[model samples]
Target: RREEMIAKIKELMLQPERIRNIGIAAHIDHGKTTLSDNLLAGAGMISEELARGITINAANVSMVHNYEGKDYLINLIDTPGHVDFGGDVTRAMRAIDGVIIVVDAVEGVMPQTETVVRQALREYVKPVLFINKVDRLIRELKLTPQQMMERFSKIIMDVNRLIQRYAPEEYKKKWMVKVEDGSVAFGSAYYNWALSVPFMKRTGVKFNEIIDLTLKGDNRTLRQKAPLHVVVLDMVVRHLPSPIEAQKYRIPHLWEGDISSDIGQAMLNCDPKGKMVMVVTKIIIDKHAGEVATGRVWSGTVKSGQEVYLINTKRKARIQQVGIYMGPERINMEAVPAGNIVAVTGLRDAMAGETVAEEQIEPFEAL
Candidate 1:
């Protein structure tokens, strides 16, 4: 089922010019790893229970699976959130078109929040905010509605401040992020469900209800009442911009080529009719499938048996096969395009952050 979903997503990508590769980044314990698990579930790569807290990158439990469906693939690096390992975070940010900034709700914004936000801005990557731990505000902390609003206010301000301070001058004044505009998302990672304020309101769930559910509900009851995937996936679709919405601003910074030429115009506008250029964000050695390079196809079509070149390594490899990264596994496919996350074989030496081109094009410089 998962492989089929992944293959279908690839088929949607037959026009590869619409795909956008992105990553998850945040401070330690802010649920970067957990959110990634939800993405995997949406891809049909993992079960809902496992997606809640599964650490796919942990040494004790490494698995990959491809979830079928959707035309775009969501390839995430799933980096460690520790500050001491800041290098890991930096390297992860450099490899993708944008970063998913996960922040604690009651905590508002923390030092590391600024750290990661600044990094994304410096790299010129797009930024999206996920304000996690809303339950914490209502339950653990018992913050009043007014108090919660105050806290939310702080988070919004800080995030906007990042746009003003770190974002390039061109975007400084015009790109202020607002929850009302779907640039920010809020939810509880532990409960394995996220809902935007508007979404929760629409569903008729109150703030107090959220608190009661998180603090009072048991596993069985919660599972029956609120499945994690439904809430998390809802936020992803509502708040997280698709590749098309994202590339409108992303390509200008990630690529420095002509926006009017075939490749330039296609990639700049994320059009679906041009040569493909994807950045492989994560690579793993699959015991059964050999080397697996997972990334987003920025443009063009990538089908099985197609010849492609590594922009970072400057070597060419055949698209021996294509697949989606399900939990420690892959769903084999004929090809996939720009709007999806995909896995490939035949690039044994491909490393994280490596760029893949359809032909012998000049390498795009890393931001």
Candidate 2:
């Protein structure tokens, strides 16, 4: 059954429109990993009991979801929230087109929050907001609806200020997360429930009911009504761009080559048939797998046994293994096409920010 499921997911990966490469980013202790744990629980990738605590490094999991009568394959990366591990977040930005920026409602925005957002915008990664730990605001702070609105508004304004300052002019307004548009969400990652305005309307679960339930310690029913994955993933599908849409503008910002050139056009169009253009974003030295390099396939299909050149290292290595990530474990596959995150082995010199291609292509600007 697991093999069959993996095969089905690999088939879905061939379609760029159905793929979403996203990362979870935030300041330390902001529930970024906890939010990821809940999302993984929803997809059966991880157990609900193990979905709490800090993420020391980066982890990726693939989930197939159905939204608006379309099947979407989402590749989610859980990144470390500590300032010391900020390098992992920077490497993660290169591998994703969109990011779910988790913020603690009680804490609002912090210094590391600004740091991650700046790094994300530098890579042209789109942002979606999830104001997590709302239960604290209601139960601990005891803020009324009006006060909650005021706090939420301030958080949005502060985030938008950073976006406006760092984000490209074209996306300054387009990418801002607005509560009315369902681009922003509120909930508690610990209780495993979240709700956007759209979700609240669909399920008819008002904020007042949430407050009552929290006061009564009745979170069991809350989880049933508003699963965290449903609320956050729905917002992602509705607001985040597919790989095709993201690569069109993102390629120019990351790659320094002429946009009209063969390699450049391939990345710009996210063409699987074009020359191979993959960027190694994170490298892991696994005990069993040796060196595993996780990357984004911008152009062409990368198959096992293919010889690829590392642009920065100026060395050629044959791909011994090719696959996608399932948390810490990697599911080996024959090939992975463009517009998706992939993991491969046999590139001994592979490092973060290095470009892997069929020929010697100009490396993307270093972080």
Candidate 3:
């Protein structure tokens, strides 16, 4: 699927409806990475501890997942779960439409998770909850049915409380996650099984059944039955807004430009026809391409040889190369349209948070 993934990704990136910009963030150490391995197995990378193939870089990795009868492109960014990497989370929040907040079913909420929640909400990024490490609750902590149910609820409640506190005034009531609506998921990502309430009903995988399987040491069933990547990707595709849908509401929060102007309207609509507008979220010094500026193209189709204005240095640059990531490898593309993460070379002065646009404009609001 590697070569076809690149082809499909290029095809899917053009249509905002088939694209999902998502991030995985958690407080605990193992859940996010292990879960990421499961989600990305088809692309590359396995768990850190279980022996591995070539490890993919964390900043940008785009993969394809098909749901129902249609194919969707998911650009997954895995952010650090600690305060030291808070800047990465902040930057990632600016680049994506939604975030999967992983809470340990046993460890519950931690300070870093709460901070990640606050950052995502502030950036106008939507949040979904994945209560991971359920096997630990059964195999180690050993909670009963009532206790397990309550444990999940308390964590969900605690998460909602944080959401309420940090969410914008308009979304304060609207953005809260619910089990019934399928925004919250339950699983042990290490064991590779995850189910939402809706998924549970459809698959006939009741709560107690998981407990029984855990006791019987049936890891293989969970891995095959639910599959962490499939369930999580489905929830993301269903719950998170596409870029065109999200940009209308998000551009207003991130940019201080004229709302009635051409560029502003283009960005708000995520129109590929207008001036190229991009927000640089990451900067990499590549051995081949000196400095690679990775960012989200928020407005128009950014192509090779196009002239752009960097908000930071106030210097104009002609695009040297326009590319997108395929794991650690960067593939050259002639052009990339709105609503996709793009990598470019030859913006000498552009920094991590720099804004690049075809039209000279004020920089977007920093995260």
Best by lDDT: 2
- TM-score to true structure, per model: 0.79, 0.93, 0.92
Predicted candidate 2 versus true structure: per-residue lDDT over 1-367, tens digit per residue = 5665666677778788988888888888898888887786775655432245423465567776777788788888655557644566666787788888888998999988898888898899999999988899898999998898789899989998989888888988888888998999988989888888998877788878877888889989878778888888888888888898999998888788989999899999999999888888778889999998888899999999988998888888788899886544578888889998888999878788778999888987453
Off by over 4 Å in 2: 47-50, 53-55, 78-80, 84-89, 365-367
CA lDDT, every prediction?
0.63, 0.82, 0.81
Query: lDDT of candidate 2?
Result: 0.82
Model 1: ten consecutive residues of lowest lDDT: 58-67
After TM-score superposition, the amount by which residue 105's alpha carbon in candidate 2 deviates from its true location, in angstroms, is: 1.2
**On TM-score, who's better, 1 or 2?**
2
Stretches of candidate 3 above 4 Å error? Answer: 42-57, 78-80, 84-88, 365-367
Q: Candidate 2 or 3, higher lDDT?
A: 2
Best by TM-score: 2
Question: Model 3, 1-367: lDDT tens per residue?
Answer: 5566578768888888888888877785737777676677743423232112222345677767778888887777545455545566676787888988899998899887887888889999899999998888888988897998799899999999998999988888788998998899988877878888878877887878778888999888767777777778888888888899999998888888897899999999999999999988778788868998888998999999889988777888888999986654568998999988888998878888888999888898442
TM-score of 3: 0.92
Q: What TM-score would candidate 1 get against the native?
A: 0.79
